[PDB]
Amino acid sequence: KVFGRCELAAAMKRHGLDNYRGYSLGNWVCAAKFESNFNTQATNRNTDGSTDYGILQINSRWWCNDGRTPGSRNLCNIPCSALLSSDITASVNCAKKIVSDGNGMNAWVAWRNRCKGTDVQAWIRGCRL
Numbered sequence: 813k814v815f816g817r818c819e820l821a822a823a824m825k826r827h828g829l830d831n832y833r834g835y836s837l838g839n840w841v842c843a844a845k846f847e848s849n850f851n852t853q854a855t856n857r858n859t860d861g862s863t864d865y866g867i868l869q870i871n872s873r874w875w876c877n878d879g880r881t882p883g884s885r886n887l888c889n890i891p892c893s894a895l896l897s898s899d900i901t902a903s904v905n906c907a908k909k910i911v912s913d914g915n916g917m918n919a920w921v922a923w924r925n926r927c928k929g930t931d932v933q934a935w936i937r938g939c940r941l
């Protein structure tokens with residue numbers, strides 16, 4: 813599924829991401845835009861052999877099992893394919909574990925490079941929330 817910007821903001825708010833660990837909703841919408849272009853089916857392979865999955869590009873080295881990332885962990889206890897669903901619940905629940913892990917949203921390279929320190933409220937402007 814490719815979400816609209818406001819549709820995704822609404823879904824994320826419903827799932828408890830607005831101000832989760834102090835990160836306002838716009839941060840999450842911005843991260844999703846630049847990680848996946850709001851596409852739940854996005855995948856990208858990394859040089860180390862791991863793959864990033866779904867709307868928030870969650871990585872198989874640590875967070876999910878894809879059966880092809882040797883010696884990896886599965887800290888979210890889910891198959892990586894669950895992160896590609898039209899239902900964002902699994903992605904949100906895993907993202908909450910990631911952002912609690914110590915480096916906050918800096919875990920997402922696109923967030924650090926393209927959202928951090930910018931006017932992220934713009935991402936939710938105009939939306940019925």
Ligand SMILES: [Cl-]
Pocket residue numbers: 836837838839932933934936
């Ligand atoms: Cl915001």
Ligand SMILES: [Cl-]
Pocket residue numbers: 833834915916917
């Ligand atoms: Cl933080």
